[PDB]
């Protein structure tokens, strides 16, 4: 009794809402695939690949949103032939959101650097976004997702990264329903490495900014932080971008320039450590106060040479800690204040 070949697809005829996050495949049993074609509505063929043993065919390029595909396959065996025709329709998004992932590919960053995925649209289903984001670490370490706002989610370990750790971030959002008819416009894939442990502590009691590289004190900077009425917040800051020079505009951070606490200052050697506008930068005008008295709007004022030193030796992801000021604590959702959120609260997340 010779068997008739059987044709099994990873879709079914008449299917709709087929998600394009995965390839479409066809399998033969009691025979081999002699012919497999898939065309879109317009008759344009889709690239596919047949396995050497002739048993498995799969698409090999991206499938498009909002499309009607037609699949034709024929299987031959000693028992005879069999042909099937399947038509199906893929997801038809109401909205598309593009993801952006920091830090940059190939980059080497500090031990406080979180994984950041920012979407250009509000994410209705955060849980679906988190699931779609595949993070790999080496050596392996536990981490968790937490949302700073409706568009950006962060991933980080309980403690600072171990130097030498590889991080791989695969944002596989294409074809994924992120909620309310919003699907990922594309995928992104970044990889980066954890460099040396650089931790700079600013103690308001001593007015000193001590830089420690892998435990070792390598630089001690007299500093002037925020004057009482505009104090520098205590807490953990993540180093962000660095500038040879930059015009600091208080309106950029919510405070009108023409205000009592406003300002517009052109400074040298500026290292940003909070979205709220905290910078380590060159403050020549206050070199007398540094190490003695706080006089700034909130920045860590240091000498020109120490500012340039900081610029040259501190990198994105390195850590600045402020302690014992008269300020409060840096908001966990500052954008660079991730570490100020307790692990239990971060691990619990906020996907809802
Ligand atoms: C950063 O937030 C701005 C500052 O705190 C420094 C530039 C200090 C300052 O504004 C000043 O008046 O010297």
* 35-44 own/partner pairs: CB under 8 Å, 24+ apart: 35/72, 35/73, 35/74, 36/71, 36/72, 36/73, 36/74, 37/71, 37/72, 37/73, 38/69, 38/70, 38/71, 38/72, 39/69, 39/70, 40/64, 40/67, 40/68, 40/69, 40/70, 41/67, 41/68, 41/69
- Ligand 1 center from residue 248 Cα (angstroms): 9
Which superfamily does CATH assign the domain made up of 196-337 to?
L,D-transpeptidase catalytic domain-like (2.40.440.10)
Going 205 to 208 to 213 to 218, the CA torsion angle's sign is negative
CB atoms within 10 A of CB 109: 22
If you take atom 1 of ligand 1, which residue's CA is the nearest one? Answer: 299
Question: CA quadruple 93, 99, 105, 108: dihedral positive or negative?
Answer: negative
Q: Any idea which residues carry the catalytic annotation? A: 281, 299
- Residues placed in the known binding site: 177, 180-181, 263, 276-277, 301
Way the structure was solved: X-ray
Residues 307 and 281 sit within 8 Å (Cβ to Cβ): yes
The residue length of the chain stands at: 352
Resolution (A): 2.5
- Nearest of 171, 199, 228 to residue 313 by alpha carbon: 199
Please work out whether the CB of residue 279 comes within 6 Å of at least one atom of ligand 1: yes
Residue 50 near residue 33, CB atoms below 8 Å: yes
Span(s) in the chain for CATH 2.40.440.10? 196-337
The encoded tokens of residue 74 equal 């024929």
| Cα 214 to Cα 189: distance, rounded to the nearest angstrom | 29
The CATH number of domain 92-195+338-352, selected from 2.40.50.1020, 1.20.1250.20, 3.30.1600.10, 2.60.40.3710: 2.60.40.3710
* Ranges of CATH 2.60.40.3710 domains, the chain: 92-195+338-352
Report the alpha-carbon distance of residue 345 to residue 329 in Å, rounded: 16
Largest CA distance in the chain: 99
Decide: 296 in ligand 1 pocket, CB within 6 A.
yes
């Amino acid at each position: 009794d010779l068997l008739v070949p059987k044709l099994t697809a990873s879709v079914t005829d008449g299917a709709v809402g087929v998600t394009v996050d995965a390839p479409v495949s066809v399998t033969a049993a009691d025979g081999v695939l002699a012919a497999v074609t898939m065309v879109n509505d317009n008759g344009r063929p889709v690239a596919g690949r047949l396995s050497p043993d002739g048993l498995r065919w799969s698409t090999t390029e991206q499938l498009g949103y909002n499309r009607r595909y037609t699949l034709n396959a024929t299987a031959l065996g000693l028992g005879g032939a069999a042909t099937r025709q399947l038509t199906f329709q893929t997801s038809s998004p109401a909205h598309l959101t593009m993801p952006y992932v920091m830090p940059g590919d190939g980059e080497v960053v500090g031990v406080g650097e979180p994984v950041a995925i920012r979407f250009d649209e509000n994410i209705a289903d955060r849980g679906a976004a988190e699931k779609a984001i595949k993070i790999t670490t080496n050596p392996p370490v536990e981490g968790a997702f937490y949302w700073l706002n409706n568009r950006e989610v962060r991933w980080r370990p309980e403690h600072f990264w171990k130097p030498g750790t590889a991080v791989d971030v695969a944002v596989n959002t294409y074809g994924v329903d992120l909620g309310e008819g919003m699907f990922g416009e594309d995928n992104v894939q970044t990889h980066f490495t954890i460099g040396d442990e650089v931790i700079a502590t600013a103690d308001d009691n001593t007015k000193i900014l001590t830089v420690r590289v892998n435990g070792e004190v390598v630089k001690s900077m007299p500093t002037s932080m925020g004057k009482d009425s505009t104090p520098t917040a205590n807490g953990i800051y993540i180093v962000g971008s660095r500038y040879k020079h930059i015009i600091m505009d208080s309106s950029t951070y919510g405070v009108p320039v023409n205000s009592p606490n406003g300002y517009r200052t052109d400074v040298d050697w500026a290292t940003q450590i909070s979205y709220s506008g905290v910078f380590v930068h060159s403050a020549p005008w206050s070199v007398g106060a540094q190490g003695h008295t706080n006089t700034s709007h909130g920045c860590l004022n240091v000498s020109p040479s120490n500012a340039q030193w900081f610029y040259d030796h501190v990198k994105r992801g390195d850590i600045v800690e402020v302690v014992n000021t008269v300020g409060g604590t840096l908001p966990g959702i500052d954008g660079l204040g991730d570490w100020n959120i307790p692990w239990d609260q971060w691990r619990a997340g906020n996907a809802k």
